[PDB]
Scaffold this motif. Structure first.
Motif, mmCIF file in Angstrom:
data_model
loop_
_atom_site.group_PDB
_atom_site.id
_atom_site.type_symbol
_atom_site.label_atom_id
_atom_site.label_comp_id
_atom_site.label_asym_id
_atom_site.label_seq_id
_atom_site.Cartn_x
_atom_site.Cartn_y
_atom_site.Cartn_z
ATOM 1 N N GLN A 1 4.000 0.497 2.737
ATOM 2 C CA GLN A 1 3.532 -0.074 3.995
ATOM 3 C C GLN A 1 2.558 -1.223 3.752
ATOM 4 O O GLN A 1 2.091 -1.432 2.633
ATOM 5 N N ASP B 1 0.831 -1.200 0.000
ATOM 6 C CA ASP B 1 0.000 0.000 0.000
ATOM 7 C C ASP B 1 0.869 1.256 0.000
ATOM 8 O O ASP B 1 1.790 1.370 0.802
ATOM 9 N N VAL B 2 0.584 2.195 -0.900
ATOM 10 C CA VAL B 2 1.283 3.479 -0.899
ATOM 11 C C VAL B 2 0.554 4.398 0.086
ATOM 12 O O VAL B 2 -0.600 4.751 -0.155
ATOM 13 N N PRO B 3 1.204 4.771 1.190
ATOM 14 C CA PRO B 3 0.547 5.557 2.246
ATOM 15 C C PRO B 3 -0.194 6.809 1.775
ATOM 16 O O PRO B 3 0.357 7.625 1.033
ATOM 17 N N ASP B 4 -1.441 6.930 2.226
ATOM 18 C CA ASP B 4 -2.308 8.085 1.974
ATOM 19 C C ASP B 4 -2.644 8.290 0.493
ATOM 20 O O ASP B 4 -3.048 9.380 0.085
ATOM 21 N N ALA B 5 -2.503 7.222 -0.292
ATOM 22 C CA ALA B 5 -2.654 7.270 -1.746
ATOM 23 C C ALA B 5 -1.774 8.348 -2.394
ATOM 24 O O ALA B 5 -2.127 8.921 -3.425
ATOM 25 N N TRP C 1 -1.260 -2.380 4.566
ATOM 26 C CA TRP C 1 -2.551 -1.809 4.939
ATOM 27 C C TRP C 1 -3.691 -2.763 4.612
ATOM 28 O O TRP C 1 -3.582 -3.586 3.706
ATOM 29 N N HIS D 1 -8.062 -3.286 0.131
ATOM 30 C CA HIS D 1 -9.246 -2.664 -0.451
ATOM 31 C C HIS D 1 -9.046 -2.576 -1.979
ATOM 32 O O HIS D 1 -8.044 -3.070 -2.497
ATOM 33 N N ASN E 1 -3.980 2.735 -5.096
ATOM 34 C CA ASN E 1 -2.715 2.690 -4.352
ATOM 35 C C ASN E 1 -2.348 1.299 -3.803
ATOM 36 O O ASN E 1 -1.334 1.150 -3.123
ATOM 37 N N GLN E 2 -3.174 0.294 -4.094
ATOM 38 C CA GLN E 2 -2.860 -1.106 -3.798
ATOM 39 C C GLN E 2 -2.861 -1.983 -5.057
ATOM 40 O O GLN E 2 -2.779 -3.208 -4.958
HETATM 41 O O1 LIG Z 1 -1.868 5.754 4.913
HETATM 42 C C1 LIG Z 1 -3.034 5.259 5.528
HETATM 43 C C2 LIG Z 1 -4.080 5.037 4.483
HETATM 44 O O2 LIG Z 1 -4.261 6.300 3.822
HETATM 45 C C3 LIG Z 1 -5.405 6.335 2.986
HETATM 46 O O3 LIG Z 1 -5.591 7.579 2.365
HETATM 47 C C4 LIG Z 1 -6.578 8.447 2.971
HETATM 48 C C5 LIG Z 1 -5.853 9.622 3.614
HETATM 49 O O4 LIG Z 1 -5.058 9.143 4.685
HETATM 50 C C6 LIG Z 1 -6.837 10.675 4.127
HETATM 51 O O5 LIG Z 1 -6.117 11.811 4.581
HETATM 52 C C7 LIG Z 1 -7.798 11.086 3.009
HETATM 53 O O6 LIG Z 1 -8.747 11.963 3.511
HETATM 54 O O7 LIG Z 1 -8.481 9.933 2.499
HETATM 55 C C8 LIG Z 1 -7.575 8.968 1.908
HETATM 56 C C9 LIG Z 1 -8.435 7.876 1.298
HETATM 57 O O8 LIG Z 1 -9.021 7.063 2.304
HETATM 58 C C10 LIG Z 1 -5.326 5.233 1.926
HETATM 59 O O9 LIG Z 1 -6.567 5.170 1.245
HETATM 60 C C11 LIG Z 1 -5.023 3.862 2.551
HETATM 61 O O10 LIG Z 1 -4.835 2.913 1.516
HETATM 62 C C12 LIG Z 1 -3.774 3.952 3.435
HETATM 63 O O11 LIG Z 1 -2.657 4.332 2.633
#
Ligand SMILES: OC[C@H]1O[C@@H](O[C@H]2[C@H](O)[C@@H](O)[C@H](O)O[C@@H]2CO)[C@H](O)[C@@H](O)[C@H]1O
Ligand SMILES: OC[C@H]1O[C@@H](O[C@H]2[C@H](O)[C@@H](O)[C@H](O)O[C@@H]2CO)[C@H](O)[C@@H](O)[C@H]1O
Length: 129
Positions: free
Chosen positions: A31, A18-22, A33, A36, A40-41
Motif C-alpha cells: 500500500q 509500505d507493507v501494511p501493519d509492518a 502510507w 516514516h 516496512n518502508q
Molecule cells: O497498515 C497501516 C500502518 O500500520 C502500521 O503498523 C502499526 C499497526 O497497525 C498497529 O496495530 C500496531 O500497534 O503498531 C504498528 C506500528 O505503528 C505501520 O507502522 C504503518 O507503516 C502502516 O503499515
C-alpha cells in the motif's frame, strides 16, 4: 554488508511503498502510507534486481497482467521478484514489463499497489529518496 534499504516514494501521492501493519507475512499486498523511517518502508536494491524488505523478503508480482497484486514473498530468484527503476520514474517488473501502480490513481493512506500497463502517470512515478 548491511542492506541499506531506502524509500520508494510516489510522486503523485507523496506517500511511500509500505507493507501494511509492518507484517512480514507472505502474500501481503503493498500500500501507500505516510513516509516514516520504519523497516516496512525500507527497500534495498540488489544486483539480482530485487527490492528487498526485512532482509530476506522481496517485492513480488503475483501475476503478469493489469491488476495483478504487488506483494511480498520470501526471496527465491524468480523473475517476478526483479524490478528496474527507469529514468522516467517508473518501477517496472522485469518479467511482466508492467509498472508499479497506485490503484485507481489513489493517493491516500491505504491505497493498494498493483501492476499496470505503463502510462507514466503520477501514480506510476517514484523516487528513492
Ligand atoms: O497498515 C497501516 C500502518 O500500520 C502500521 O503498523 C502499526 C499497526 O497497525 C498497529 O496495530 C500496531 O500497534 O503498531 C504498528 C506500528 O505503528 C505501520 O507502522 C504503518 O507503516 C502502516 O503499515
Ligand atoms: O487499474 C486501475 C487504473 O485506474 C486508473 O485510474 C482511473 C480509474 O480507473 C477510473 O475509475 C477513474 O474514473 O479515472 C481514473 C483516472 O483519472 C489509473 O490511471 C491506472 O493507473 C490504474 O490504477
Amino acid at each position: 554488508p548491511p542492506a541499506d534499504g531506502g524509500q520508494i516514494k510516489g510522486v503523485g501521492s507523496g506517500r511511500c511503498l509500505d507493507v501494511p501493519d509492518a507484517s512480514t507475512s507472505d502474500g501481503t499486498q503493498l500500500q501507500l502510507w505516510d513516509c516514516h523511517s520504519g523497516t516496512n518502508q525500507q527497500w534495498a536494491a540488489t544486483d539480482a534486481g530485487e527490492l528487498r524488505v526485512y532482509g530476506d523478503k522481496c517485492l513480488d508480482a503475483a501475476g503478469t497482467s493489469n491488476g495483478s497484486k504487488v506483494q511480498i514473498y520470501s526471496c527465491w530468484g524468480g523473475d517476478n521478484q526483479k524490478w528496474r527503476l527507469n529514468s522516467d520514474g517508473s518501477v517496472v517488473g522485469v518479467q511482466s514489463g508492467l509498472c508499479l501502480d497506485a490503484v485507481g490513481n489513489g493517493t491516500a493512506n491505504g491505497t493498494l499497489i498493483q501492476l499496470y500497463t505503463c502510462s507514466n502517470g503520477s501514480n506510476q512515478r517514484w523516487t528513492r529518496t
